[PDB]
């Protein structure tokens, strides 16, 4: 018996997002569907297990959940739950649209309630401190809204999806300035550094959601978002030795959301015949990196 | 004899903006014109009175005006004067375009001169402090430019209106990051908390101005802005008990600008057959809230 | 023998940018080509000389270069080198596209390597301080990417140009919030104040690059960018007496990038029949100001 660390939801999140990326290649390359289905089944299975473990945590370790919830830093990871729930919904849609729709709405209402209760509460002051300014804040504030946007578009609710999209995009632009200034001034401690991987996510998750809503039209906004996304990738690549100064660890799954969304967006750029060479590199790169994450995770698992 | 607190201009501002919202419903529902005209006449009458009271303040309480002007916090409320002057111009345009145009230009030149003198002066440093980072800054920096944008569009100056629009939109995105970080860290004191209502304004005033310039075309930008606007609404609703911790007060008119612009934008979304259900809710909600403000103000007035 | 202060690259930068502005008037007014060619030849000659002087610095004053590189403030000026190299490439393209393309790629790879190594390294914390938050940061972070964007578009690489464009535009919006808050709180010391001129650059360099990529189409984004650009101009004009409190100096070339890009963008607005009166004013204003910079520089040179 142990309380499931909430961050572990990043594993099915990354796998689910990568399933969706491969799904979007099926009409260019049919074998991509089998790869998508396998990734989707594994992500869903891991999600079920982690959901049940989290239900156990709520039942028997409620004070740990309460403390994470009220923490001005640790609360953000709870947003992984409804995010992964929506992504699993998006996977399941290929097989059962009714069950998919239920999960998508549960995740959407859940993330919106979550932010509305906790993200706003921060504006009361005195609890959040300068040192609370962490990449994890992107999860409730930004990533959850993008995930809702694309999931609702999948269901046919394009205009409602644009509202969530806007909420996420503007929230992103409003938070990042203060995050990067904080990182410049204050050296994130090693135990939090893997969460630098979340810094990769905004531009790529943003363009993926946008392309999901706008029928895959690769337009000026999409190209703009990709450009900033690759800038951040190059920066994070340069920073990687510092990120893992104290060793490789499981927290590196933090990168998987950005990586998977880079792959997903790459499929749309390829479909649209925009920067196809860059698209192929992006898609291959993201898959290799997530493959390495899977292989390091199997290892850790075969070492208890 | 007393010096008129400059913040009181928020009352005719909210009423004038709400008049304009109803005005935009007239071709869907004719009776909306009577409601618009009544609101517009009351707003204009209150504006005349407050202008005369402010002329008296300048004549006999000039040092109080000087101190408010030089304050790195209190200067912002002076921007209410040219903002309300433009909105009254926009109302009067339905009856007398020549007088309307004069007021619109006086307000536009006045707000631009005001910002150019005072907002820039802050960049000299040493006067503005971290604790000066208040929602009121939106008034000179953001709301005034949006108001110019839409007023100039009304007069047929669409391209000039886009310049003001851009100034306001980029200024908004450049200020809000630091405002929300400050609110997270430092608990705004109760006496300033009603000004949290100004946080509702940017997205809604922005989309209202945009739709005024672009002939009511509800496009991707407009939907994006509405999404962030509703996020902030939900946050402020959650925060409302904290906002009024020390009691309901007249400062709550601070919400009326955002509310009225939510109503105005809702008329355009409805006209464009986008999210009509949300539009009706938004329009009804905003009217009820401003109706409550009017009823609390009549009360206060019937209690001296 | 002396080590060339890296900031001096701002002189050929401003002249090169102004050459390109005049170049864009040639099909409206043929005599503009002669003016462009003369400015372009002078900028290129000054650039060659400064490059050779900088090669000498690297060879015989390497520790001075190393210290500037590692400084969390002074590193930014090194970005002037690849920026000016690209602009000289853009000039030379009218005579020799092959040599132009080589310079453009050297400058593009060089600026991207430079940022990737140094701008990201800041996020390790503990070196950059709040007082490091200076306008010069725009050079590597923002201006270099815009310059790449427009130079690559010149070569026909529009989509790749949009990636650089996005990187610069989003980087701009993400840095400026914290810069203006810092300037409000902390009074930039006189010796750095001329660099306030760099604050003029982002919106104008941004719209110039955008118009270069999008075939000169003056659209809503372009008008938006111009509006914020003129707001900042008016602010900087008001601030000018404070900027030069301790006297006029050669650092005022800092303004030339924004001024030249105001002129360049003005040619496109004029071509597109948008705000032609404003365009003429902008173009004339920018030329007069840069003419004054040239005349003060000849003076200083005729006084050793
Ligand atoms: C992922 C879905 C998350 C839903 C979270 C439910 C939280 C309800 O719990 C609430 O937390 C608060 C907000 O800070 C409080 O102030 C409450 O009164 C408390 O009931
Ligand atoms: C709403 C219209 C407002 C116009 C305000 C006029 C202010 C003119 O007053 C000016 O204020 C300054 C700027 O900080 C000064 O430095 C001046 O010299 C002073 O004359
Ligand atoms: C304008 C083109 C600039 C290229 C700059 C080359 C810099 C290479 O120098 C590098 O600087 C670093 C990054 O901070 C280091 O950590 C290195 O190991 C060092 O080799
Ligand atoms: C995954 C969703 C996490 C929900 C975290 C719940 C936050 C609990 O919030 C708590 O709820 C209480 C009693 O149940 C109140 O007594 C509290 O004081 C409050 O701390
Ligand atoms: C950070 C946000 C960047 C927003 C970029 C928006 C770019 C709008 O790009 C659009 O391109 C289309 C091509 O015909 C046309 O609609 C217009 O040229 C333009 O509005
Ligand atoms: C998002 C990236 C997924 C795209 C992977 C495409 C790999 C195929 O590669 C491409 O195949 C072609 C036709 O099918 C060719 O004409 C090519 O030149 C070749 O590069
Ligand atoms: C509504 C517009 C408010 C204008 C506020 C005016 C700010 C006054 O600015 C003052 O003007 C002076 C004398 O008149 C100078 O002597 C000052 O030192 C300066 O404080
Ligand atoms: C924070 C700013 C968000 C800017 C969003 C701009 C969205 C541009 O949306 C536009 O949609 C039109 C539909 O055909 C086309 O012009 C293009 O797809 C696109 O440029
Ligand atoms: C901005 C919100 C103002 C719109 C208010 C519209 C209220 C009318 O309500 C609508 O009337 C119709 C036709 O007129 C119908 O067909 C509807 O189903 C009904 O909802
Ligand atoms: C114009 C490009 C400027 C390059 C600045 C080079 C930064 C040098 O970086 C230095 O390089 C070294 C040795 O050569 C290492 O020994 C160092 O410790 C490192 O400081
Ligand atoms: C800070 C960023 C501002 C982005 C502004 C984007 C404006 C998009 O403007 C575009 O105008 C065109 C006119 O038909 C159409 O494509 C749409 O109306 C709209 O998408
Ligand atoms: C970017 C600004 C450069 C444009 C400079 C244009 C100066 C010419 O000026 C214009 O010339 C015309 C025809 O050529 C006229 O019809 C005009 O009314 C006149 O203003």
PDB file of C-alpha atoms in Angstrom, chain C residues 184-265:
ATOM      1  CA  UNK C 184       8.615  51.106 -13.979  1.00  0.00           C
ATOM      2  CA  UNK C 185      10.186  49.996 -10.695  1.00  0.00           C
ATOM      3  CA  UNK C 186      13.932  50.498 -11.273  1.00  0.00           C
ATOM      4  CA  UNK C 187      15.320  53.640 -12.949  1.00  0.00           C
ATOM      5  CA  UNK C 188      17.677  52.509 -15.716  1.00  0.00           C
ATOM      6  CA  UNK C 189      20.962  54.333 -15.057  1.00  0.00           C
ATOM      7  CA  UNK C 190      21.994  57.096 -17.461  1.00  0.00           C
ATOM      8  CA  UNK C 191      24.800  55.134 -19.031  1.00  0.00           C
ATOM      9  CA  UNK C 192      22.284  52.531 -20.263  1.00  0.00           C
ATOM     10  CA  UNK C 193      19.445  54.874 -21.146  1.00  0.00           C
ATOM     11  CA  UNK C 194      20.243  55.239 -24.843  1.00  0.00           C
ATOM     12  CA  UNK C 195      19.333  51.558 -25.121  1.00  0.00           C
ATOM     13  CA  UNK C 196      15.710  52.635 -24.452  1.00  0.00           C
ATOM     14  CA  UNK C 197      15.841  53.225 -28.224  1.00  0.00           C
ATOM     15  CA  UNK C 198      15.710  49.422 -28.641  1.00  0.00           C
ATOM     16  CA  UNK C 199      12.215  49.527 -27.100  1.00  0.00           C
ATOM     17  CA  UNK C 200      11.059  51.179 -30.349  1.00  0.00           C
ATOM     18  CA  UNK C 201      12.152  48.210 -32.413  1.00  0.00           C
ATOM     19  CA  UNK C 202       9.947  45.180 -31.683  1.00  0.00           C
ATOM     20  CA  UNK C 203       6.604  46.188 -33.222  1.00  0.00           C
ATOM     21  CA  UNK C 204       8.193  47.833 -36.287  1.00  0.00           C
ATOM     22  CA  UNK C 205      10.793  45.142 -36.935  1.00  0.00           C
ATOM     23  CA  UNK C 206       8.010  42.600 -36.405  1.00  0.00           C
ATOM     24  CA  UNK C 207       5.633  44.164 -38.976  1.00  0.00           C
ATOM     25  CA  UNK C 208       8.467  44.742 -41.444  1.00  0.00           C
ATOM     26  CA  UNK C 209       9.434  41.066 -41.282  1.00  0.00           C
ATOM     27  CA  UNK C 210       5.797  39.989 -41.500  1.00  0.00           C
ATOM     28  CA  UNK C 211       5.152  42.129 -44.579  1.00  0.00           C
ATOM     29  CA  UNK C 212       8.332  40.703 -46.174  1.00  0.00           C
ATOM     30  CA  UNK C 213       7.024  37.211 -45.751  1.00  0.00           C
ATOM     31  CA  UNK C 214       3.400  37.752 -46.659  1.00  0.00           C
ATOM     32  CA  UNK C 215       4.060  39.513 -49.945  1.00  0.00           C
ATOM     33  CA  UNK C 216       3.332  43.020 -48.605  1.00  0.00           C
ATOM     34  CA  UNK C 217      -0.275  42.329 -47.714  1.00  0.00           C
ATOM     35  CA  UNK C 218      -1.327  44.967 -45.206  1.00  0.00           C
ATOM     36  CA  UNK C 219      -3.812  43.045 -43.126  1.00  0.00           C
ATOM     37  CA  UNK C 220      -5.283  43.159 -39.653  1.00  0.00           C
ATOM     38  CA  UNK C 221      -2.162  41.884 -37.922  1.00  0.00           C
ATOM     39  CA  UNK C 222      -0.045  44.454 -39.674  1.00  0.00           C
ATOM     40  CA  UNK C 223      -2.331  47.329 -38.636  1.00  0.00           C
ATOM     41  CA  UNK C 224      -2.354  45.969 -35.052  1.00  0.00           C
ATOM     42  CA  UNK C 225       1.414  45.935 -34.905  1.00  0.00           C
ATOM     43  CA  UNK C 226       1.678  49.476 -36.317  1.00  0.00           C
ATOM     44  CA  UNK C 227      -0.714  50.754 -33.627  1.00  0.00           C
ATOM     45  CA  UNK C 228       1.401  49.395 -30.772  1.00  0.00           C
ATOM     46  CA  UNK C 229       4.500  50.558 -32.565  1.00  0.00           C
ATOM     47  CA  UNK C 230       3.258  54.190 -32.676  1.00  0.00           C
ATOM     48  CA  UNK C 231       2.182  54.015 -29.018  1.00  0.00           C
ATOM     49  CA  UNK C 232       5.742  53.108 -28.076  1.00  0.00           C
ATOM     50  CA  UNK C 233       7.114  55.844 -30.351  1.00  0.00           C
ATOM     51  CA  UNK C 234       4.981  58.480 -28.615  1.00  0.00           C
ATOM     52  CA  UNK C 235       6.066  57.180 -25.199  1.00  0.00           C
ATOM     53  CA  UNK C 236       9.763  57.274 -26.193  1.00  0.00           C
ATOM     54  CA  UNK C 237       9.371  60.764 -27.640  1.00  0.00           C
ATOM     55  CA  UNK C 238       7.949  61.917 -24.272  1.00  0.00           C
ATOM     56  CA  UNK C 239      10.811  60.183 -22.498  1.00  0.00           C
ATOM     57  CA  UNK C 240      13.509  61.594 -24.752  1.00  0.00           C
ATOM     58  CA  UNK C 241      14.621  64.405 -22.376  1.00  0.00           C
ATOM     59  CA  UNK C 242      15.109  61.826 -19.612  1.00  0.00           C
ATOM     60  CA  UNK C 243      16.889  59.427 -22.022  1.00  0.00           C
ATOM     61  CA  UNK C 244      19.495  62.137 -22.820  1.00  0.00           C
ATOM     62  CA  UNK C 245      19.552  63.710 -19.337  1.00  0.00           C
ATOM     63  CA  UNK C 246      23.332  63.302 -19.224  1.00  0.00           C
ATOM     64  CA  UNK C 247      23.882  64.396 -22.823  1.00  0.00           C
ATOM     65  CA  UNK C 248      23.584  63.306 -26.414  1.00  0.00           C
ATOM     66  CA  UNK C 249      25.766  60.379 -27.246  1.00  0.00           C
ATOM     67  CA  UNK C 250      26.592  57.840 -29.885  1.00  0.00           C
ATOM     68  CA  UNK C 251      24.482  55.202 -28.090  1.00  0.00           C
ATOM     69  CA  UNK C 252      21.473  56.907 -29.639  1.00  0.00           C
ATOM     70  CA  UNK C 253      22.093  54.728 -32.733  1.00  0.00           C
ATOM     71  CA  UNK C 254      20.054  52.267 -30.626  1.00  0.00           C
ATOM     72  CA  UNK C 255      16.938  54.026 -32.063  1.00  0.00           C
ATOM     73  CA  UNK C 256      17.991  53.462 -35.674  1.00  0.00           C
ATOM     74  CA  UNK C 257      16.719  49.865 -35.930  1.00  0.00           C
ATOM     75  CA  UNK C 258      13.167  50.819 -34.939  1.00  0.00           C
ATOM     76  CA  UNK C 259      13.312  54.003 -37.023  1.00  0.00           C
ATOM     77  CA  UNK C 260      14.527  52.192 -40.156  1.00  0.00           C
ATOM     78  CA  UNK C 261      11.897  49.485 -39.730  1.00  0.00           C
ATOM     79  CA  UNK C 262       9.221  52.172 -39.284  1.00  0.00           C
ATOM     80  CA  UNK C 263      10.365  53.556 -42.645  1.00  0.00           C
ATOM     81  CA  UNK C 264      10.428  50.103 -44.277  1.00  0.00           C
ATOM     82  CA  UNK C 265       6.951  49.195 -43.050  1.00  0.00           C
TER      83      UNK C 265
END
